[PDB]
UniProtKB/Swiss-Prot annotation, chain A:
Gene assigned in the entry: RPL27A
Family: Belongs to the universal ribosomal protein uL15 family.
Subunit structure as annotated in this protein's UniProt entry: Component of the large ribosomal subunit.
Cell compartment(s), UniProt: Cytoplasm
GO cellular component: a single term: nucleoplasm
Species name: Homo sapiens (Human)
Predominant location category: cytoplasm
Protein name, entry field: Large ribosomal subunit protein uL15
Curated annotation (Swiss-Prot), chain B:
GO MF annotation list: RNA binding; structural constituent of ribosome
Similarity comment text for this entry: Belongs to the eukaryotic ribosomal protein eL13 family.
Predominant place of localization: cytoplasm
Tissues expressing the protein: Higher levels of expression in benign breast lesions than in carcinomas.
GO biological process: blastocyst development; bone development; cytoplasmic translation; translation
UniProt name for this protein: Large ribosomal subunit protein eL13
Noted disease: Spondyloepimetaphyseal dysplasia, Isidor-Toutain type: An autosomal dominant bone disease characterized by early postnatal growth deficiency, severe short stature, genu varum, platyspondyly and severe epiphyseal and metaphyseal changes in the lower limbs.
Native source organism of the sequence: Homo sapiens
Entry keyword Ubl conjugation: yes
Covalent link Glycyl lysine isopeptide (Lys-Gly) (interchain with G-Cter in SUMO1), residues: 173
Amino acid sequence: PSRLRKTRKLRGHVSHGHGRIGKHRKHPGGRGNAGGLHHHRINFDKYHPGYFGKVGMKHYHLKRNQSFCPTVNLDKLWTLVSEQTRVNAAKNKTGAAPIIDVVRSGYYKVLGKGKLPKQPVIVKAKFFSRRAEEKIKSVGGACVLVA
Amino acid sequence: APSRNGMVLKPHFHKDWQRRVATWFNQPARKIRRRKARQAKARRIAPRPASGPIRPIVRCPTVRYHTKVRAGRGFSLEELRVAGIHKKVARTIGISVDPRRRNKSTESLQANVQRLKEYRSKLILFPRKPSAPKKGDSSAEELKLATQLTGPVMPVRNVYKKEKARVITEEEKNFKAFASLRMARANARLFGIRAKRAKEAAEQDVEKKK
RNA sequence: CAGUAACGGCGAGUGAACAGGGAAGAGCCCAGCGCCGAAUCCCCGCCCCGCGGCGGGGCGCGGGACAUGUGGCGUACGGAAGACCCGCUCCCCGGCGCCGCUCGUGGGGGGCCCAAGUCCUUCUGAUCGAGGCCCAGCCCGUGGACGGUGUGAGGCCGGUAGCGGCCCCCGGCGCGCCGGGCCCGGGUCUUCCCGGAGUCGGGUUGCUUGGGAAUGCAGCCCAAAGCGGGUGGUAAACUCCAUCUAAGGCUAAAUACCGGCACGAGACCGAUAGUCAACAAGUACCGUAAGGGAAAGUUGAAAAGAACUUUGAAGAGAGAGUUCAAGAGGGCGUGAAACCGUUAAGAGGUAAACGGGUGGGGUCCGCGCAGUCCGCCCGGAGGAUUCAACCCGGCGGCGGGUCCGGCCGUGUCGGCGGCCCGGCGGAUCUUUCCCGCGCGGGGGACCGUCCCCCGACCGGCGACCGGCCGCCGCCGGGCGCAUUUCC
RNA sequence: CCGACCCGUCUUGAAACACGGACCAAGGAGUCUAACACGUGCGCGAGUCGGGGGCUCGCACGAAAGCCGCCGUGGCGCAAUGAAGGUGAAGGCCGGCGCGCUCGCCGGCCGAGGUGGGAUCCCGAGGCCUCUCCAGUCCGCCGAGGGCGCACCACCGGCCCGUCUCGCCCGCCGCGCCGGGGAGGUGGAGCACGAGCGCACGUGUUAGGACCCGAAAGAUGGUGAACUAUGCCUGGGCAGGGCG
RNA sequence: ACUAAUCGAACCAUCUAGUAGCUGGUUCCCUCCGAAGUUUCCCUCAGGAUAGCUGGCGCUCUCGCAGACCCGAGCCACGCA
RNA sequence: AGCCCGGCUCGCUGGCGUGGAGCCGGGCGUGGAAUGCGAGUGCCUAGUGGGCCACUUUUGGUAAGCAGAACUGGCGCUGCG
RNA sequence: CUACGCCGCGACGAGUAGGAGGGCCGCUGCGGUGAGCCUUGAAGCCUAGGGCGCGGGCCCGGGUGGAGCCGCCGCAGGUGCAGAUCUUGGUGGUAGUAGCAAAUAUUCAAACGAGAACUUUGAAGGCCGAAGUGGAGAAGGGUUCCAUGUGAACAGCAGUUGA
RNA sequence: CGGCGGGUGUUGACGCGAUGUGAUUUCUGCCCAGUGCUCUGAAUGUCAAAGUGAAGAAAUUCAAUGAAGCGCGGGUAAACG
RNA sequence: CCCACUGUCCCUACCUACUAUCCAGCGAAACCACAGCCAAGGGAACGGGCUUGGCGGAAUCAGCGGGGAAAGAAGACCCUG
RNA sequence: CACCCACUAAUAGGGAACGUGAGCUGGGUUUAGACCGUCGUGAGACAGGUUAGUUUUACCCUACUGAUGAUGUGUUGUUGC
Ligand SMILES: [Mg+2]
Ligand SMILES: [Mg+2]
Ligand SMILES: [Mg+2]
Ligand SMILES: [Mg+2]
Ligand SMILES: [Mg+2]
Ligand SMILES: [Mg+2]
Ligand SMILES: [Mg+2]
Ligand SMILES: [Mg+2]
Ligand SMILES: [Mg+2]
Ligand SMILES: [Mg+2]
Ligand SMILES: [Mg+2]
Ligand SMILES: [Mg+2]
Ligand SMILES: [Mg+2]
Ligand SMILES: [Mg+2]
Ligand SMILES: [Mg+2]
Ligand SMILES: [Mg+2]
Ligand SMILES: [Mg+2]
Ligand SMILES: [Mg+2]
Ligand SMILES: [Mg+2]
Ligand SMILES: [Mg+2]
Ligand SMILES: [Mg+2]
Ligand SMILES: [Mg+2]
Ligand SMILES: [Mg+2]
Ligand SMILES: [Mg+2]
Ligand SMILES: [Mg+2]
Ligand SMILES: [Mg+2]
Ligand SMILES: [Mg+2]
Ligand SMILES: [Mg+2]
Ligand SMILES: [Mg+2]
Ligand SMILES: [Mg+2]
Ligand SMILES: [Mg+2]
Ligand SMILES: [Mg+2]
Ligand SMILES: [Mg+2]
Ligand SMILES: [Mg+2]
Ligand SMILES: [Mg+2]
Ligand SMILES: [Mg+2]
Ligand SMILES: [Mg+2]
Ligand SMILES: [Mg+2]
Ligand SMILES: [Mg+2]
Ligand SMILES: [Mg+2]
Ligand SMILES: [Mg+2]
Ligand SMILES: [Mg+2]
Ligand SMILES: [Mg+2]
Ligand SMILES: [Mg+2]
Ligand SMILES: [Mg+2]
Ligand SMILES: [Mg+2]
Ligand SMILES: [Mg+2]
Ligand SMILES: [Mg+2]
Ligand SMILES: [Mg+2]
Ligand SMILES: [Mg+2]
Ligand SMILES: [Mg+2]
Ligand SMILES: [Mg+2]
Ligand SMILES: [Mg+2]
Ligand SMILES: [Mg+2]
Ligand SMILES: [Mg+2]
Ligand SMILES: [Mg+2]
Ligand SMILES: [Mg+2]
Ligand SMILES: [Mg+2]
Ligand SMILES: [Mg+2]
Ligand SMILES: [Mg+2]
Ligand SMILES: [Mg+2]
Ligand SMILES: [Mg+2]
Ligand SMILES: [Mg+2]
Ligand SMILES: [Mg+2]
Ligand SMILES: [Mg+2]
């Protein structure tokens, strides 16, 4: 809607909101990121530290698929199964524990953030964190690995 | 000229982009034309399936997707020769073939050959001369059971074999998954250098006493 | 994927690919090694069948190509030949007559047609305007898109709608026939055969690329191998593995389209706008040439385009006439401002013009010119149903232990009630009833939402509705005809 | 009668002897796309979004609208840190034991710690009532103090990743130049019961013609020796006297 | 000097709407608020970035909102200059 | 967020129950000068970055309607007597 | 009591560059709506007419004109001009002004004609003075050549004449 | 741009090509340090690619040899001066 | 520099032709914020306008060159980019 | 500016956009041509010398010079202040 814009309120004002002294000129100061080290150095230093230079090893032909390892925390772990599984395991008289396969859910690593409800469970994952393993063992569960 | 806080932006508009702009105003017309072509093809091949030849069971390559299975280009020649189908007859009866695909493992081979055998079981085949039924199929089951098949033939589905809840054994409880993974990484890293050091020690061992 | 990996005075900036999901989907052929009496091909004369894009067949002690290699089999997915066994599986080519009639309802092209007001009364220059058209309403409507017609029209006209009609031509799909070609496929075993060279690759140079100790391309030099060669994104040696098979060839679809032919549409522009060009526009005109390149739309419904009289040599006038209008008269719809002529009014020696305040004059406005109204009461002079109150009928508002139903919300019960005779789901358990190796797909049970259901309790009639009552209010009709009521 | 210099613009300063403007009509200059950032509105919400494709008499509108869900592939978010190999975010209280050695093994509970503020809310002694009382019945208001404390702020702890220092232990089908753990500092764009996604609008910045008009220039490809400059070919022309 | 009224590099078309820190212009009304020509860095001095000055959007609190006209019934707010 | 009482923790310190810091309870309101005012906090952001003048102080200059500084005010951005 | 409404009290009001809000200010088109307006006269334009609003502007009367137009709720812009030595078009003052002054020169009578300084005939006076103001060609022009007729426009006065 | 392409050249040192000074007369002195130009390679200093040899498992590293040029040595001013 | 020569001059005058001038016909352009009488003051430091005073009388003709910091060209000199 | 000759009463000093270029001239400075000296390797430079080098418009407003007229006395004229 051009009828709601500031141009419609600037009719009759000769400078169009850009000043009489400095005016509105084409490109004072350069085009784009001009002078990032010379006359716009303060802005780049103040708001973009680390912008200039090389750090680290360069690796040609990076394949993002090779390092694909999505993660799931322990507090969200029980959401990967239906609540029917949870209540069946919780109210179960025997010591039977359900098996949660996070790879089926699309997660490869089990991270250890959060806490678990105190009931045993078997977790099928490609990778486990140390604290995630400790928390699963503490509730009587077990961790198994898949490839 | 930068102004206060703000993201450093790199527009790729320095290369006279206005002469090469693709507008999509023909997108609805293109969809209509594609739908008309689809309907025309489906009417052209009257009893044959609309989508076309049956496609094989195919696991996706990389480590990101190898849990997922999809449809492939065509059945491998090994699948055809163990399913009893000639590789030149298969394309005549709606079986896509792929001469350049190998079968690295037997499980996928068995899955694809069971797919082929079940498809051959479901196939209705018309004789070349309708008045002279030679060896194709019986007229009773091809009169009113012959239907245009919509969608992909025998669609590929991800099946998840459910495993039931079980009482956790002690040897699962004593398993050390983090330690096992760390030591597996260490062994994979240090395998070659360990072999070289063992070989060096063996070379020093066979000349120590002299 | 991704503005990512990477490139970049690592500055400005640049910048892919794999995998994934889709649109479409189609595969093949030589050379070479071979085998087969060159099996092969072109041209020309004669005859037959044809013409319609010039072919089919037969004949030639008729020419030529070709052993410096034609054709059949055969191609990396292996192939060939012998044996053994199994299966006869039926191809493509162009016409003869016709059906389905080709098909989202014709397959295409062309042509000619198909509903209903010019009804009554009026406006107008003309009307397509306005009012009406008893039957629930002028008529048709599968047609109320559009355009024309003296306005503004579904019914005046052309069209529009319609798996509407008729006629002509053209093309591809099945059957029996026609002329002839048409030649064995699969599985097992044995015996053989297997590949593209100034090319790959290496050095160097130059360009290019995201390709970074060099991605690709090219020049020059060197110059290959056959358990070989290429690639495996950091140069090199050793070693294992993976993957493909280069230096020969073809291939539809998805895809692009500011030129062309023919169409449809638009929240676009509306004659200084929109193409330069709405018009005898790439025209007039300019430059030696390359080339540059405009301006310019509108009388009126219909020319009905001003007969005729008169002045002037004529241009041009005054009359007359047409028209609804020439205060529309051939660049003529409307006709602004700048500027000019005349008329009227006012003023004028500090250039005009301006802000504030008054005064005078003038054009107009006030239906101005005997100045508002209207509620009650009082008084007078006149009318009139009827005023109040009761009766009958109708309808509304409010209330009622729900008086009676219909119910409604939350739960609460046994679930007779649904996997046959109710669903939808579940990362819940199972044949230990059922078809795929001790290895699935079914069918079951369970759970959760539930589906309407049988009733009852709970709070209520709610803004979800009815019937009864009781009250109130209103209206219509009676009676009430005078100290009432109203005018 | 009083007041009254011509506007626009640049400028410390314009009525200026500063520039533009004779008059009138029409045209005439912050736009669109892309990418951010913040604010606001809307929907859903640890999710969100079909935008590409497909399915619906194919088409008056409709190139619209509707739907897909085993089309959510994928994007953004839900996890950070390191150059990288990689690693990757829960503690408090009551206990019995070593030796409760600044710590090693379990129980039971609780479920992201504490301090100072902290809107709001809660309890609340005591008060306010009438024709009066000795007598208590139901609810309202004011109320000193007290309590739970939202968001948010300051602080002190705690947890994850990198890097130092110190030191002691544990694990095993590989007994290793193996793996793991602790305490104390420090580096992070972190955690510490999510807040994001989509769409619209506004403002600001940037790349694009980029608010409009403006160079001297540079490059590519063509046209000119009808004027002039030079060479060549072929033509034409230049009274009358003087010196000698 | 001359090279078609053009010569210290002709003319035509295109790249090209070339770039410009420089000049000129930049279109309706009312209301509210309302500056700076200073610090630091820059081949910077006719310009930018930066802090400062400005506006807008808010948000977190503070005294209470007193009696329906009447009428308070030592102690009178966080905090700021 | 002050003062005063107790008590607890420390691996820092150390003749010492020492010192220092931190923590946990309690009691103190005459709110510990005047005057005025309601405060705190966050995001986005334009224009500007040529200035000039005056009292006083003041540097160079013979001086300047010159050039350069400090403080306040004004003009710029401001009409009116 | 259009709660986006109405009412009360107090204080205050400068403003460039700049920022924000409101606009029942204005232009154009679209979706809605007004059983809107209009040939018994729309848009547009003119007006010493009557008013409204602080203002942007708006309504009504009169005339002209001859077929379309507007209000409200939303939507969308190629949306408002005094300037830019602005673009295009038109018009003024200058102004009946500069000027119609290079190469000696015209005069009389007559004819045609509405009209004669300029046409034509006759007479007179002159100039070019054979290196011409003569007679013919090349280049270039392209019908200007010739005859008749016209007096619109052109021949910078006129014209009965003319390329 | 290119071709054993083309101009001088249908030419041959009394000719082409490149310069300075500017008829005649009379003269044209000194400087080869500098910068140019040019002659000589004399053992010869430095010197690229290719080639040669050595170390290495290879990339590679090192070494040896040494074309013009530059240095080294003459000449030249009616060459700049 | 000398002789001669003359209006170059003392020191100007007179004459001739074409204009200019007036008339009939025809008929532009430059330029133009508005315009046009001065002195002084102040002021962007040399006013046509403002302040104070001097004053101010229609419409014009032929000349004129003091002013309009007259017109003509976005200063070509200087500086900046 | 200076200096000299001669006369003279005296041969005083200054302003008016260093008066006066739409009044003139163009000798000088101060474009492009060219020569010399100095500087520079060179292009080229020289408040160093020399020579040749386009001086445009008024018809507008005012000012001024003249020329008609205008206001008022009824018209008109003479003589006058
Ligand atoms: Mg303003
Ligand atoms: Mg500035
Ligand atoms: Mg991304
Ligand atoms: Mg590139
Ligand atoms: Mg597909
Ligand atoms: Mg062969
Ligand atoms: Mg019509
Ligand atoms: Mg119609
Ligand atoms: Mg009809
Ligand atoms: Mg039809
Ligand atoms: Mg490598
Ligand atoms: Mg028009
Ligand atoms: Mg046009
Ligand atoms: Mg010409
Ligand atoms: Mg005439
Ligand atoms: Mg009319
Ligand atoms: Mg007209
Ligand atoms: Mg200016
Ligand atoms: Mg100045
Ligand atoms: Mg001004
Ligand atoms: Mg002045
Ligand atoms: Mg000037
Ligand atoms: Mg200027
Ligand atoms: Mg001007
Ligand atoms: Mg102008
Ligand atoms: Mg306009
Ligand atoms: Mg859609
Ligand atoms: Mg995904
Ligand atoms: Mg707290
Ligand atoms: Mg902390
Ligand atoms: Mg920003
Ligand atoms: Mg521009
Ligand atoms: Mg330009
Ligand atoms: Mg250049
Ligand atoms: Mg010539
Ligand atoms: Mg620098
Ligand atoms: Mg400036
Ligand atoms: Mg100063
Ligand atoms: Mg200023
Ligand atoms: Mg101020
Ligand atoms: Mg002031
Ligand atoms: Mg104000
Ligand atoms: Mg515009
Ligand atoms: Mg204008
Ligand atoms: Mg303006
Ligand atoms: Mg004249
Ligand atoms: Mg004349
Ligand atoms: Mg003569
Ligand atoms: Mg002649
Ligand atoms: Mg004439
Ligand atoms: Mg003639
Ligand atoms: Mg010579
Ligand atoms: Mg000499
Ligand atoms: Mg040498
Ligand atoms: Mg010598
Ligand atoms: Mg004066
Ligand atoms: Mg200039
Ligand atoms: Mg200039
Ligand atoms: Mg002077
Ligand atoms: Mg003068
Ligand atoms: Mg002059
Ligand atoms: Mg001179
Ligand atoms: Mg000169
Ligand atoms: Mg000369
Ligand atoms: Mg005159």
